[PDB]
Amino acid sequence: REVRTIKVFTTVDNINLHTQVVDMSMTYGQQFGPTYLDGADVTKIKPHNSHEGKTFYVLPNDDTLRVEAFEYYHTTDPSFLGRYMSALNHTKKWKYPQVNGLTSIKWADNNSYLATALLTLQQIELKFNPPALQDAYYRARAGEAANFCALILAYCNKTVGELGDVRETMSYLFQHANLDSCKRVLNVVCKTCGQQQTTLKGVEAVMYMGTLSYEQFKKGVQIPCTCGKQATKYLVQQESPFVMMSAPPAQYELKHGTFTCASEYTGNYQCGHYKHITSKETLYCIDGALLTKSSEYKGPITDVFYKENSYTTTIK
Amino acid sequence: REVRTIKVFTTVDNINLHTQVVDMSMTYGQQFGPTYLDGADVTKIKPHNSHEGKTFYVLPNDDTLRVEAFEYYHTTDPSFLGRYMSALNHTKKWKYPQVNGLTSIKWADNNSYLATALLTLQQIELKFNPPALQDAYYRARAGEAANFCALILAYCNKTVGELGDVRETMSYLFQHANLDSCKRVLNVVCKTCGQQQTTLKGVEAVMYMGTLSYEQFKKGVQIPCTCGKQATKYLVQQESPFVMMSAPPAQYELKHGTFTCASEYTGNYQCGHYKHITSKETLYCIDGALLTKSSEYKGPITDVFYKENSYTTTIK
Ligand SMILES: [Zn+2]
Ligand SMILES: [Zn+2]
Structure with a gap:
């Protein structure tokens, strides 16, 4: 009784x-x-x-917990905590070896896109806003990345095992980072229509989709104009601690000392594998727990990260 | 042969x-x-x-289609187009009545959160960046909202029938809108620690979670300080065409002429229903295809939208 x-x-x-x-x-x-x-x-x-x-x-099922959950995670998606927990039940069983001084992820559960994203974060200057990500990223840098990886999956609405894209994953993470001071000024020149300047801020100031080469972006890339002509778009001014250049996977040569790190994708639109390339004293290719080195590198590159501080064009 | x-x-x-x-x-x-x-x-x-x-x-399965898809949708999530199509197969069968001059959605498939989001968008000044959303929103305002609703589901990673939160949905839509000029300055005052000013930009400048009352936000709201004291946070400066105030659902009185529109949620953390309240010549409550009016309104309000242009505090 x-x-x-x-x-x-x-x-x-x-x-x-x-x-x-x-x-x-x-x-x-x-x-x-x-x-x-x-x-x-x-x-x-x-x-x-x-x-x-x-x-x-x-789950956040009273007002106190609703406030606690929003203040910690910066989301009110009702399914967030369940998805974070479901991912964590897997990521707590992953291994996180130190490879060339960085926390990587031993391959499991189709996680190669997460490994190269995690490796990239440790090479660029970035501060997260949600306490959940601040706390988990600190642990990940120390080598205990299970909570950080499960949060990435939750914030991106990806389940363990699902096909992921590195550019999209970085976009979600940057949305939750303090990039407020980042600024980009572009000019687009059409021989028919004239010139048009545009200013971008925050995440849009550090991401570009269309070419992998920061140098080419500075010289000019060809894009369509609404009048039918091909116009030239080039970078006028950049203020940010890094930039990310992305493109559909294509064979591309990475030159030691001209970039920070890069992601390589082998496969097709339905199925593939990512590797990470980092430019240090030589070129290191990190594939989960695996490590190789080379003096030159060519492969199907999708994303390249570059160091930056302040850039101003000399084009008049 | x-x-x-x-x-x-x-x-x-x-x-x-x-x-x-x-x-x-x-x-x-x-x-x-x-x-x-x-x-x-x-x-x-x-x-x-x-x-x-x-x-x-x-699906974007060659480089030409990859570029076309990113330029139209501003996402590289591999599952995006399949999720957009899966939602559209449902939303094309929904009905979109004009209710008090606005495009609403007749209730189907647990879509009440989408109806109040759609009604809200038509009452605030907002321009989308992805051509997909620009084109679909134009059609939605004209009364043909199936593509817009399917895009909302896709951008939010929600399937038809899934429980949705209005605040989270608006956050996703605002991420894809041009809010670059929006600016918010806040001051937080602790009797022990002193004062600390913070500046927010873009989406973070127009959204606040914790109180529904814009007036209270101007006078000060109580929040925890790290020293243990209760501090006071108040609005110093606001530059935006609207603001959105959100809170966990609680009984709240809406006064005619003091707000633009609001969302009401009846239920619990696992199951509930949204209605829309708009302040025009009187208070109209839009519930999908249904319409009622009242001179006063009290209910479990979750989100309130206010008109804005430029605000500067008189607090010294
Ligand atoms: Zn032109
Ligand atoms: Zn204090």
């Missing part, structure tokens, strides 16, 4: 804890709704004695 | 067409990969005589 109970804590951010007394004869789901223990779904499980004192994630 | 063929066109943007000759003895999938006809998946279907001359969507 005596209900037997244990004390547990619920949370949405793993920092602020909420004391609960749970009935050991009812499932966690009957008492909390969807409930997770370090990523594992315990909604249909009844409390174990070993659960006493442990922390469980729940 | 003579292979019988028809001419069709493939596309990723429904503007640029690519001539194809298809074998009538093979499925579209065998020849194009995943293939769609006005949203319907025809990958496993063989060509019909009536298909001659028609346009089919395909």
